[PDB]
Amino acid sequence: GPLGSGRMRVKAIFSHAAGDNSTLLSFKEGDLITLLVPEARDGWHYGESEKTKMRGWFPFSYTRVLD
Ligand SMILES: O=C(O)CN(CCN(CC(=O)O)CC(=O)O)CC(=O)O
């Protein structure tokens, strides 16, 4: 597809706090996250916060897929 297409985003419907751990992504409810891998692994997805531009793994269950 055209370069830049295929983006998938989710909306945080619960907040998630990484703590002192750069592998995990923090976000507040309402933040949008662009997925950067094709599937969740063991219930964890990986993406980038629209608000903070940080990246990391998070519980997929804390979000819902935007359509
Ligand atoms: O529709 C809204 O008011 C805001 N939507 C924008 C995108 N919507 C559009 C819609 O529902 O008509 C799709 C979605 O929430 O998946 C985001 C949200 O609920 O936080």
Looking from the CA of residue 65, the nearest atom of ligand 1 is 16
Domain ranges of the chain: 1-67
b/e sequence 4-15, b meaning 16+ C-beta within 10 Å: eeeeeebbbeee
State CA 21 to chain mean position distance: 15
Catalogue the E-assigned strands of 1-67. 9-12, 32-35, 44-49, 55-59, 63-65
Q: How far is CA 56 from the centre of its chain?
A: 7
For residue 66, the ligand 1 atom closest to its alpha carbon is: 16
19-57 per-residue burial string, b: 16 or more CB within 10 A, e: under 16: eeeeebbbbeeebbbebeeeeeeeebbbbbbeeeeeebb
What technique solved it? X-ray
| Resolution for the entry shown, Å | 1.5
Fold classified for 1-67:
SH3 type barrels. (2.30.30)
CB 51 within 8 A of CB 27: yes
Ligand 1 pocket, CB under 6 A: 11, 66-67
Contact 66, 11 (CB under 8 A): yes
- Asked if 24 contacts 57 with a C-beta cutoff of 8 angstroms, the reply is yes
Residue 41 tokens read as: 């692994």
